[PDB]
């Protein structure tokens, strides 16, 4: 989920 | 020197990371292993960001992006350390301020692991491996991660293929004196996979012993699939 | 077209062997594991003699010849299994008289390992692996085996080079419709290595548990 | 040793 979150992040 | 795809892979370069070891206290196996796990945790943040700039990576479903990273994360970590250690001799650059020699590996209980990493270093030394090649193998290793939980196989294979091609164009471009160099490069990946697995198993045992604090990201990768 | 190394490797390709399981002995896991080891053990004799027919291999020191075989043996065993299993589905042809389906893998405590090998099988099926490619890759596997103990690094590298070049030619000649096919083949080696290790470690644990008798050669290769 | 012997011995298929 942090992996996921970090993958869902930005720019 | 320019391939399009390779230049996207150089985004994170040049990398710098520090352990900032505390000299206030004596070094122990626990201290050294903690440092490494901390470094690993933080590099993974860099690795994650670098992967997003891989053309095609972000286009995969998230579960698939996760699947590949979960299979290939240690291979990428090891590959980095390997590259940083190229101009050194029987030492591993885990950070710019944390260079492990045989004694330090012995203290950490990592002689066997760090040796294997040095074997990998040795091989890339005599091939005189380049920034460009290094970043490309990372992406290949990632794409060729051999996960068994891939939703869209054709996309992942398309990506393997795109990266493979990037590597061919680059060696064709830059190393005509050896028409197989791409092949030789690809032939170093088995040792990378092997070493990775040795590292993961070892650090998994370390997690279970429960004596070494580990941050969330590193644990997530360690405990997956 | 013709390639000299590929032709030699095809011809050196050895004959079938058989598991010859005891029909008297009851279907347990130690029966399965014992058969596989006796087989493996006899299969190693074949591999040893097969290595020698690889162009350049005998030219190496006896020490290097051992080192390579000591690193690669399980990869070669597995590649054998994989190849035999390409005409099947979700089963592994360990020998012609010993084929393991999923249920039989469970019974022997080999589901995970055999699934990984199956993964290998399915990849080569999706690529339509030809005999010519298979024998070349098996040779490359041996030569690219990454032993820590190599005396003459340049000779072994030569042997890698030679074997590699042959694959390049074969794919250049037979598969111009895929100018990357050779590299795609090489990129299957990681999973081979990984599966080899998984297997070495599983069977090493079994050796340690002491319940499965193992013939000498097998043990000697296992403890290396 | 057994590996060595067999390398040194001849292939009898
Ligand atoms: C074995 C495993 C737990 C592991 C721990 C720590 C690393 C760190 N890699 N750090 C680097 O890649 C790097 C070094 C020095 C730079 O200047 C930049 C980056 C890898 C793998």
Question: Bound compounds, please?
Answer: 4-hydroxy-N'-(4-isopropylbenzyl)benzohydrazide
User: Strand order of the main beta sheet of chain B, please?
Assistant: 1-2
Q: SSE order of chain A, as H and E? A: H
The second-level CATH architecture of chain B is: Orthogonal Bundle
Order of helices and strands of chain B: HHHEEHHHHHHH
Distance between the termini of chain A: 19 Å
Count of discrete domains of chain B: 1
The best one-word shape of chain A is elongated
What class would the helix/strand composition of chain B place it in?
Answer: mainly alpha
Q: What profile does the largest beta sheet of chain B have? A: 2 strands, antiparallel
Percentage of β-strand residues of chain A: under 5%
Q: Which structural class is indicated by helix and strand composition of chain A?
A: mainly alpha
Specify Rg of chain B, calculated over alpha carbons: 17 Å
Globular, elongated, flat, extended or rod-shaped: what is the shape of chain B? globular
Motif (LXXLL motif 5) (chain A): 3-7
Modified residues (Phosphoserine) (chain A): 1
Subcellular location (chain A): Nucleus
Protein name (chain A): Nuclear receptor-interacting protein 1
Give a description of the structure:
The complex is a heterotetramer, with two copies of chain A and two copies of chain B. Chain A is mainly α and 11 residues long. Chain A has one helix and no strands. Chain B contains ten helices and two strands. In chain B, a hairpin with a 2-residue loop joins β1 and β2. Chain B has 225 residues and is mostly helical. Chain B has a two-stranded antiparallel sheet. Chain B has one domain (1-225): Orthogonal Bundle (Retinoid X Receptor). The radius of gyration of chain B is 17 Å and the shape is globular. The interface between A and B is small, with 7 and 13 residues. The structure holds 4-hydroxy-N'-(4-isopropylbenzyl)benzohydrazide.
